[PDB]
Amino acid sequence: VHNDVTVPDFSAYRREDVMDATTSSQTSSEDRKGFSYLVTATACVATAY
Amino acid sequence: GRLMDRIRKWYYNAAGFNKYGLMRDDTLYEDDDVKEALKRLPEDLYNERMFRIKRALDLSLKHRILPKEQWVKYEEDKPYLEPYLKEVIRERLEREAWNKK
Amino acid sequence: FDYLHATAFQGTALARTVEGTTENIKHLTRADLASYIDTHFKAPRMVLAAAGGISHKELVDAARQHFSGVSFTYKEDAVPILPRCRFTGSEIRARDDALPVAHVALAVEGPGWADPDNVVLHVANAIIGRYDRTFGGGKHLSSRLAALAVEHKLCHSFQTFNTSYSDTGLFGFHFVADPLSIDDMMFCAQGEWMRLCTSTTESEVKRAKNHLRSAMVAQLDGTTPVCETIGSHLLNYGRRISLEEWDSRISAVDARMVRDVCSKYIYDKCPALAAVGPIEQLLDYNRIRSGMYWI
Amino acid sequence: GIHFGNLARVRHIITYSLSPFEQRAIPNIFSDALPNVWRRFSSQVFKVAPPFLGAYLLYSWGTQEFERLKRKNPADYENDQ
Amino acid sequence: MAPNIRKSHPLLKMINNSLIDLPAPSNISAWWNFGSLLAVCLMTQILTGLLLAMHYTADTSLAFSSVAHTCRNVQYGWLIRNLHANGASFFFICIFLHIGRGLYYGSYLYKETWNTGVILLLTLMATAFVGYVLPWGQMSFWGATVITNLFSAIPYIGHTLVEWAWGGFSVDNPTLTRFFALHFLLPFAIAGITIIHLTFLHESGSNNPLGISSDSDKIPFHPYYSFKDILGLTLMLTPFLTLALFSPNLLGDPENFTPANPLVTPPHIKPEWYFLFAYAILRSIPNKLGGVLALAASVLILFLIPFLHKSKQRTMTFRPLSQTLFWLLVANLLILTWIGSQPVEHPFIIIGQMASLSYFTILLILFPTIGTLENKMLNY
Amino acid sequence: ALLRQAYSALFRRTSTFALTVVLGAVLFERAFDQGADAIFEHLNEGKLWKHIKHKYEASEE
Ligand code: HEM
Numbered sequence: 012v013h014n015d016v017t018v019p020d021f022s023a024y025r026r027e028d029v030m031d032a033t034t035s036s037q038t039s040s041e042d043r044k045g046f047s048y049l050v051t052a053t054a055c056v057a058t059a060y
Numbered sequence: 061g062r063l064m065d066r067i068r069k070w071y072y073n074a075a076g077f078n079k080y081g082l083m084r085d086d087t088l089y090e091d092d093d094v095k096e097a098l099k100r101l102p103e104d105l106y107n108e109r110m111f112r113i114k115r116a117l118d119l120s121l122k123h124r125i126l127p128k129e130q131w132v133k134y135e136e137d138k139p140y141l142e143p144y145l146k147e148v149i150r151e152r153l154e155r156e157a158w159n160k161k
Numbered sequence: 162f163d164y165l166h167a168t169a170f171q172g173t174a175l176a177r178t179v180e181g182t183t184e185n186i187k188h189l190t191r192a193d194l195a196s197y198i199d200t201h202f203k204a205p206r207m208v209l210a211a212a213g214g215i216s217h218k219e220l221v222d223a224a225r226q227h228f229s230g231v232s233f234t235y236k237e238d239a240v241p242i243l244p245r246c247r248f249t250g251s252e253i254r255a256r257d258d259a260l261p262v263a264h265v266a267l268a269v270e271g272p273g274w275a276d277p278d279n280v281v282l283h284v285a286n287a288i289i290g291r292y293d294r295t296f297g298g299g300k301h302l303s304s305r306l307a308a309l310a311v312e313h314k315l316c317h318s319f320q321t322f323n324t325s326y327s328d329t330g331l332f333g334f335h336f337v338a339d340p341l342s343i344d345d346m347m348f349c350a351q352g353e354w355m356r357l358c359t360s361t362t363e364s365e366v367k368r369a370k371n372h373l374r375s376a377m378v379a380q381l382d383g384t385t386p387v388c389e390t391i392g393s394h395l396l397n398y399g400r401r402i403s404l405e406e407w408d409s410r411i412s413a414v415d416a417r418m419v420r421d422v423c424s425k426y427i428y429d430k431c432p433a434l435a436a437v438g439p440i441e442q443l444l445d446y447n448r449i450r451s452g453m454y455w456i
Numbered sequence: 457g458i459h460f461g462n463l464a465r466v467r468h469i470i471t472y473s474l475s476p477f478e479q480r481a482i483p484n485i486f487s488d489a490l491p492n493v494w495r496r497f498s499s500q501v502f503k504v505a506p507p508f509l510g511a512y513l514l515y516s517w518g519t520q521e522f523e524r525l526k527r528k529n530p531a532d533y534e535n536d537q
Numbered sequence: 538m539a540p541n542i543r544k545s546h547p548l549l550k551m552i553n554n555s556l557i558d559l560p561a562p563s564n565i566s567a568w569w570n571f572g573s574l575l576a577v578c579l580m581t582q583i584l585t586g587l588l589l590a591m592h593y594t595a596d597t598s599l600a601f602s603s604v605a606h607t608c609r610n611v612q613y614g615w616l617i618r619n620l621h622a623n624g625a626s627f628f629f630i631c632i633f634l635h636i637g638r639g640l641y642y643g644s645y646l647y648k649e650t651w652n653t654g655v656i657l658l659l660t661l662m663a664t665a666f667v668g669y670v671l672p673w674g675q676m677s678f679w680g681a682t683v684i685t686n687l688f689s690a691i692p693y694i695g696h697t698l699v700e701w702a703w704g705g706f707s708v709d710n711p712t713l714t715r716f717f718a719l720h721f722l723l724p725f726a727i728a729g730i731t732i733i734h735l736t737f738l739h740e741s742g743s744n745n746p747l748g749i750s751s752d753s754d755k756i757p758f759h760p761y762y763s764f765k766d767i768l769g770l771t772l773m774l775t776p777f778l779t780l781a782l783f784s785p786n787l788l789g790d791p792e793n794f795t796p797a798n799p800l801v802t803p804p805h806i807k808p809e810w811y812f813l814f815a816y817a818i819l820r821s822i823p824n825k826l827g828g829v830l831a832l833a834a835s836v837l838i839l840f841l842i843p844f845l846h847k848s849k850q851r852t853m854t855f856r857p858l859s860q861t862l863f864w865l866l867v868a869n870l871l872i873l874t875w876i877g878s879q880p881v882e883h884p885f886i887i888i889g890q891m892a893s894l895s896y897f898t899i900l901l902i903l904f905p906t907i908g909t910l911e912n913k914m915l916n917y
Numbered sequence: 918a919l920l921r922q923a924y925s926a927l928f929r930r931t932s933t934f935a936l937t938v939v940l941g942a943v944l945f946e947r948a949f950d951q952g953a954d955a956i957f958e959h960l961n962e963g964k965l966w967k968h969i970k971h972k973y974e975a976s977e978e
Pocket residue numbers: 568569570571572573575576579632635636639642643644645647650651652653654655656657658727728731734735738742743744745839
């Protein structure tokens with residue numbers, strides 16, 4: 012049945028700030044996107060130039 | 061002389077598709093015949109074959125394989141389609157030559 | 162929803178089926194249940210609610226009479242706080258092309274009973290509303306998504322929802338449609354969300370409000386319903402929130418607010434996705450993700 | 457035209473993936489990554505390198521044998537006066 | 538009607554079904570960007586090409602000094618030139634690998650997709666041929682004189698077929714002009730055919746490493762393969778520029794810096810590198826016709842591969858034997874090429890004749906054979 | 918926190934994202950070109966007409 016199904020352990024890949032199953036990812040989100048977005052943003056500048 | 065056996069068993073480990081956990085027949089290139097064979101597969105043996113592939117793909121995209129433990133062993137490879145296929149071909153060959161008559 | 166939960170909250174407790182594992186039900190012992198009762202079923206956490214022709218004081222009396230709990234230490238008086246559950250924007254795809262229709266559920270982390278925002282959120286959820294084949298309104302409905310839903314035979318049904326919890330929440334939507342439209346559907350949906358966080362009008366909220374007020378009332382239609390509300394008001398919100406109150410909080414909400422609030426919780430957030438059935442058509446979280454900004 | 461939906465019939469395959477913002481870009485660069493790079497390189501080196509190596513020689517060889525045929529054989533003039 | 542424009546619009550519907558919602562195998566490897574990169578080469582040749590044509594002067598007396606002028610006097614002209622020229626090379630590079638891939642993963646089973654490819658390849662070769670003759674340098678000239686002459690090998694129509702090519706009775710101005718006109722046109726023909734190549738492809742979706750139905754796990758071309766193309770873009774784009782910014786003339790024969798001389802064929806005349814292998818084969822058959830014919834099939838054989846497929850499996854991923862053969866063949870070319878760059882003497886000559894014997898056999902005989910043998914070892 | 922401060926103020930609103938790239942490239946251009954020319958020029962001191970210059974540019978006659 013669907014009760015015997017669980018999302019496996021993704022610790023192996025999780026970013027440092029969302030590895031503890033007891034801390035709101037929400038706060039350390041703004042950062043996780045800021046970075047990835049930063050790279051992209053930069054990449055644009057690069058291209059631009 | 062087990063020569064032939066000792067060889068097949070080799071080439072098998074050589075091809076190493078079994079490292080992806082795929083069965084011999086799993087690798088067959090899907091031609092008009094195979095295509096028909098596959099359509100004849102009982103639903104279990106089929107959804108199974110599929111997953112085996114969707115897993116192989118997932119691997120190939122990750123650039124990995126199965127831990128040696130889960131590799132497919134030569135003697136345990138199940139030619140799940142070989143017979144179905146053969147028949148298909150047989151049927152055809154009969155239809156084919158019968159239209160030359 | 163269980164699957165949705167099972168990935169939206171993965172790893173923590175919330176991500177569990179209220180019915181539990183197959184093994185636990187197969188092995189649970191007289192004891193373990195015995196304990197569950199003792200460990201959890203305790204006076205400070207329990208609430209006797211009643212509605213209808215009943216004298217408050219009379220009630221409280223029979224209460225004192227059979228609910229005779231004695232509390233020595235401070236322990237039996239303390240309500241154990243719960244280890245907050247971690248949200249994890251991600252997905253879970255259970256596929257079975259051999260099923261009639263595919264079901265899809267998407268959601269963002271919710272605030273939790275406490276937050277006065279929940280109000281706004283519900284107002285929003287009233288704008289996108291819910292639809293389903295039998296509604297006679299059809300092509301005319303006032304819910305944007307409902308309209309298109311009809312116009313292009315998008316879904317068999319779709320529904321907004323803001324399941325709240327003590328510390329968290331699951332704001333999102335669930336629709337069921339034919340294997341071959343899942344996409345277009347989702348698309349229009351996620352669009353509405355976007356439109357919510359970007360161009361909601363005064364006329365849009367005005368209605369929702371009036372719609373919400375009604376359900377607000379319809380939740381209190383009879384005895385059981387009221388009692389439930391109370392049973393749950395005290396248990397989650399602390400006290401009892403009267404309709405007169407709820408209403409103020411609603412007449413408060415306006416456009417600007419909805420935008421800010423939905424943006425606050427929906428814009429560019431990694432969401433949770435739950436797919437079940439013949440879902441081939443809808444694909445890539447990346448793509449679904451991208452549908453979270455601009456609208 | 458649109459191919460997503462006809463593709464194929466599939467039953468019972470649950471897949472879980474996490475948003476990119478919840479996971480690491482290039483994780484386990486060591487524990488996992490490299491090792492496989494070696495793993496791969498290994499299994500393949502003995503199939504690719506052989507022939508190339510083989511050629512190289514045939515290259516060095518021919519290259520040299522040519523160069524030697526450029527140098528003079530002092531024995532063509534030990535009769536000369 | 539339709540909801541999102543992207544799917545309804547007569548034009549977007551196209552951009553869409555081929556760049557965004559296009560179904561791609563999840564596992565296609567690096568060797569799958571070469572198609573797109575090839576594109577980029579085409580886009581880069583046509584661009585730089587128009588620019589160079591804006592300053593070229595197709596005419597024996599000026600053809601040389603116009604290019605010179607175009608490099609020295611025209612703002613950034615030099616950079617343009619350089620890019621156009623190495624572009625060519627990088628084009629051929631990309632194309633040779635694009636073919637490689639195809640061979641090793643039996644993409645050639647997509648017959649039409651494949652046949653058109655050959656056509657494209659052939660054209661590119663032709664295109665690149667005339668392009669070179671334009672600068673009217675020593676090589677430009679003599680190459681023009683040889684390549685065309687090849688047709689003198691065909692009986693009857695032959696000696697005449699040349700006549701046209703040159704427009705005269707010897708390679709002179711008339712040639713240079715029509716060659717320019719030709720070079721100008723051709724690239725466009727490729728662009729067109731490519732459009733087709735891609736169409737026939739889209740009928741089957743793309744192949745993929747394992748050589749088994751990918752329908753069980755496809756992914757929208759975007760963002761997956763889109764981003765993956767941009768990376769592959771900059772990646773190749775690097776050596777290309779590097780090469781063209783720091784050592785422009787590395788890949789290029791300098792004997793072509795000496796204006797053509799209808800009277801003196803340089804003592805050390807060797808073809809553009811990307812032609813060397815063929816050059817070699819023809820150079821090993823000491824007979825006008827044979828030489829020509831050897832060359833013909835040297836490339837035309839591509840058309841056959843699709844029929845010289847015998848393995849029950851499609852890609853060589855699971856055929857160690859075939860693989861080893863494959864690489865041997867790669868290297869077999871890598872050799873043939875060397876020889877091309879080497880004078881006609883010993884050992885070189887014999888070493889050549891062999892590799893050529895080598896070449897054809899791997900393709901016409903070993904491959905189909907090791908292939909059959911292979912299935913009996915798997916027991917099919 | 919800059920990443921937050923940044924994502925929140927620049928990368929979030931797809932409309933400001935742009936202004937960031939533009940205004941950004943702009944700065945990036947200047948700084949880059951300056952250092953670049955610098956790194957180069959230095960790696961070639963005394964060999965460029967910028968160095969030899971003075972010996973003839975308003976020195977004789
Ligand atoms: C102007 C010419 C060419 C361009 C620009 C071009 C472009 C493409 C593109 C974009 C792809 C899809 C991406 C990829 O699979 O690499 C492709 C695929 C393919 N091309 Fe080409 N191609 C060219 C030449 C050739 C040639 C000369 C051949 C060989 C005869 C060829 C054989 C193939 C094949 C077999 C496929 C299927 C690839 C697969 O298995 O996925 N192409 N080509």
